[PDB]
Amino acid sequence: SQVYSLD
C-alpha cells in the first residue's frame, strides 16, 4: 500500500 503520513 505505502503511507507517507503517520511515519
Next chain:
Amino acid sequence: SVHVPGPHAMTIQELVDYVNARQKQGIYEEYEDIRRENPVGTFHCSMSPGNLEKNRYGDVPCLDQTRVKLTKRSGHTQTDYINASFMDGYKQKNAYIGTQGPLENTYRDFWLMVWEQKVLVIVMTTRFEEGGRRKCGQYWPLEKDSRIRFGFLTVTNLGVENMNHYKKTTLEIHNTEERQKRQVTHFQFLSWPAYGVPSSAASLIDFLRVVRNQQSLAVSNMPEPPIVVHASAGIGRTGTFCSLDICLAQLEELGTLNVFQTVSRMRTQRAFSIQTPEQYYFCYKAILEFAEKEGMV
C-alpha cells in the same frame, strides 16, 4: 500568481513580534489551522485505476486542478497523469512543479514532464532510502557519462559536483525525435530527513541561493520554466522548500512576507504541502535566522 503580498503582509520586525507572541506552540497551532482549511479541489485523476500505481503513496494524491498533464505519451501505460502539481511562486505563476520521488514505472513520465515543461533545474530533497524504506527511485544516470533512454528522451550525466549538503549533477536531455538537446541541472540536497527539518537552516538557505543562481543562469541562456522540486511524496520537504523560497523572495523584494498566506495558498496548489508543524515552524525560524544573520533585526 496566487502569492500576492496582500492582505496581511508582515515586515521582518513584525514577524519577530508575531513569532515572539505566538511561540513554538502557537506556531504549531497555526499549522493545524492551515490543515483545517477546506480542501478546495478534487483528486480523481490520482485515484483513477490506471493511475493508482503511478502514486508512490496511497495517502498523497494530487489535485486535479493544478496537476501537470503529460502530452506526448506513448504506450497504454502512459496516461497523461503524473503526481506533480504546478505551484505559483512570488510574482510568478508556475514557479515550481512539486512532484513525488519518481517510481520505476514513472521515470519515463517524469522525464517527459521535465521535457515538456521546459524544466531547467530539478531540486531533490530526499535520499533514495531512509530507514531502509525506499523513498525515491534512481531516475537519472548516476555515473558521469552514463545515459538512460526514456523513449525519445535520452538523459546523459555530464558531470557531478559533490559539496557540503548537496550534489550538483549536470544532465543533458536529448529529444531524439526532435533532435533537440537541453542541459538540466539536478540538485540533490542530502541533509534533510523526511518528516524532519534540515540540520542547518543556513545550509538550506545557501542551497536555495545556489538553486536560484542556477535557475537564473539557465534562464538567461534561453515565461520562466518552473523548477521541479521533489522529495519522496513531494509535499513535506517540497512545500517547506518552496514556501521558504517564496517568503524569502517576497522579503527580499517587498520587505514583507506572510508564512500563513504562503502555505495556505500553496496547499491549494500542491495539496498537503508542508507535512509537520516542525517544518511549518522551520519556515518562521529559518527566516528569522536569515534575518538575524543579515542584521535585519
